[model samples]
Target: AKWNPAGARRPVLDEAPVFYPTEEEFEDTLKYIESIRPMAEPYGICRIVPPSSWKPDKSIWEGSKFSTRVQKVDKLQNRKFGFEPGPEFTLQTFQKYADDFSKQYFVPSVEDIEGEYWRIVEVPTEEIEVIYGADLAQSGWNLNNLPRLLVPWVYVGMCFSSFCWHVEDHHLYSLNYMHWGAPKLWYGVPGKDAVNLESAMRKHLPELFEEQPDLLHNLVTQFSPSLLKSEGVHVYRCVQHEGEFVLTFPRAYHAGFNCGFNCAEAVNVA
Candidate 1:
């Protein structure tokens, strides 16, 4: 439950570009992403800082309860996997747990930074409304009914809970908006270097692939970006704080972990 990964140094790679959108640019979710294409496409992932005046509607599901997938952060470092249903924590209980955990283990930021450098987070799927593209027959289906691919997700995380190195399903672009709490650290491999990223993993992680031949498919491993960098893969980095948006380009392999307890919403788009 309480352990730190040794020698898992998070190298300081070139930081990914962070885009600041004007009010005009943030109008339509998908279109605004298009506006940053030229600048962000190359890096494969970029952070977008919203304009001055912006606020989300009050969360409609305030009283809702949610479950979690609990993983051992120490195991994630060495390519191990297995998780189970965590308690169905209500907002009040989760907040108390987060605060106590934060205070006990990481009262000092600088010291904690040296303690760990890895990426991951968890989520439980729920519905949100969306009707997009010709794919929707636009007939029988209720306009309000939607799919996770487009509807978005909400993840509540505590310290050290992480999301491993992986790309989005069908290689769609992913945009994550942090609602509040602590900053989240992220690393991305450019789209063009995806193959190079794969090879780097297979080479250094030969043993895991044998045990789990479709290791990448399972999306369950976290090979350090710093380790991949040593193998010549181009790794880019960024820190996503509350009120900021991190957008990852199609086929961009990315991984990140929370700085502390945080809540974020993410959606995949083409």
Candidate 2:
């Protein structure tokens, strides 16, 4: 299926940012978070728990310096499940890294349940998927690298900025961790917007569009709003060591940003 922009003309982020629990306090909720982490992994979701002293800047994103660093990557297009096998990184390493951060309860909620094409519950647990590459290390092709790690229970959902819209793979939920200079904004399409998206899908992607025509528009319109200033839509200012974790309903439609206005520097720990 082709990438659908959720009908929003541009990257629509949220205004007043809602805050999450502190890392130390979050540790109290570790058990519940650990159980939910694996369930959310199928949908590209995870949790967050940072080490002590990793505090974030208490400034609004508009005044932040980090912006989306655009680049061209060809490796992502050739791999199944969009997993990259760079000389510096690997799935095995990711698994190892995740193990280290496991047991640490940091993720507040599961986000990105209803991805571009499928829902986490709708797909089978053993299905293989196609995804794009979104490597942060090479995001700028410059010296933008920083201290980062793909902790356990996290999923680094790296989709192409220009391709594959709808949910892909075992779409469950996501909880993005922020371990860098800035945070990414998350905008979710409410019931009304989701309907618009499904409505448009019937025509734009007839080949891949589902028969349930009623659920089209509401899902697509979630992408076209000017600013995510509504309820049910969360815009997290994931400053260094922070996160924009979201737990969506069965078919919730959502998106993220890295345009410097809202960007993070770590992987999702599911």
Candidate 3:
């Protein structure tokens, strides 16, 4: 299957701008984010390449156990997903497993270790998936009201593991930092294009809305940017590699797949 659903037209996309924040500038993540608003706001999503000098703690990768849900690459290719557990691997083990997995299976053809892909539940919306302790990071909210809004979660995934197109819960801004991993190929539609995205999805995947008045809150649909662009919607693309950050603005619809094994942390804020 191709990136676009069925035989929709292929889109020639523009890459989102990449920002390389200075080490001094990046010390304050939030502040650096605010400063880049003007450049990143229009694209709705942009990659933040960390300064070469920056280094973070590597202690968390040890002794942390987590389970990953499985999905089929063909299903994901056709805008579908599955609900199944693969196996339990701790952060360190996951790295070793993923390293071996990527070597033997370079693509998402067949994989039960030979057709199913595995990755963290990684923040599937609350309605469709049980939030089984997905939040791995402690969010030190500064007396903010209802602090769950900004709680961060960890994502451990290998090649072809992906998140589908969806907006942040409550339409808040989403911040994602990739601590280590292969590049993530992302397609982002700006907040202003929210209506266009809805129309394009409803127009093409009409059967999906019979159960609900609007896009399902499940975050399962994987509409291709080429198809959406053919439908006259604006889309921007970017690649988030290791030691980088990506942010999606409020109402910004975004989705992408891992280039290979990686670990990322994400959260949303108002």
Best-fitting candidate, scored by lDDT = 1
Q: Report lDDT per candidate.
A: 0.67, 0.31, 0.64
Measured on C-alpha atoms, candidate 1 has an lDDT of 0.67
Tens-digit lDDT track for model 1 on 1-270?
Answer: 222444334466898998888776766555667778888888878998877866642243345567777665645546335555566665556767766776654353622542454422111121111110101022101112224216667778766666778888897887787888777778899899899888988897788888878877775676777678888888888888888889899999998777677788777768
lDDT tens string, model 2, 115-230? 32222112222232222124431311111221131222322322222222244223333334443322344444433344454454443445433443433322222222233333
Q: TM-scores of all models?
A: 0.81, 0.35, 0.75
Model 1 TM = 0.81
Poorly placed runs, candidate 1 (over 4 Å):
1-8, 57-62, 118-149
> How much is the lDDT of residue 127 in candidate 3?
18
Candidate 1 residue pairs in clash (backbone atoms < 3 Å): 119-256, 119-257, 120-162, 120-163, 120-256, 121-162, 121-163
Alpha carbon deviation, residue 68, candidate 1 (Å): 1.2
Q: Lowest-scoring 10 consecutive residues by lDDT in candidate 1?
A: 127-136
Residue-wise lDDT of candidate 3 within 149-196, one digit each (tens)?
A: 255677877766668788888868877778777776788999998889
Give the RMSD in angstroms, all C-alphas superposed, for model 3: 7.5
What's the C-alpha lDDT at position 196 in model 1? 88
Per-candidate RMSD vs. true structure?
A: 8.3, 15.8, 7.5
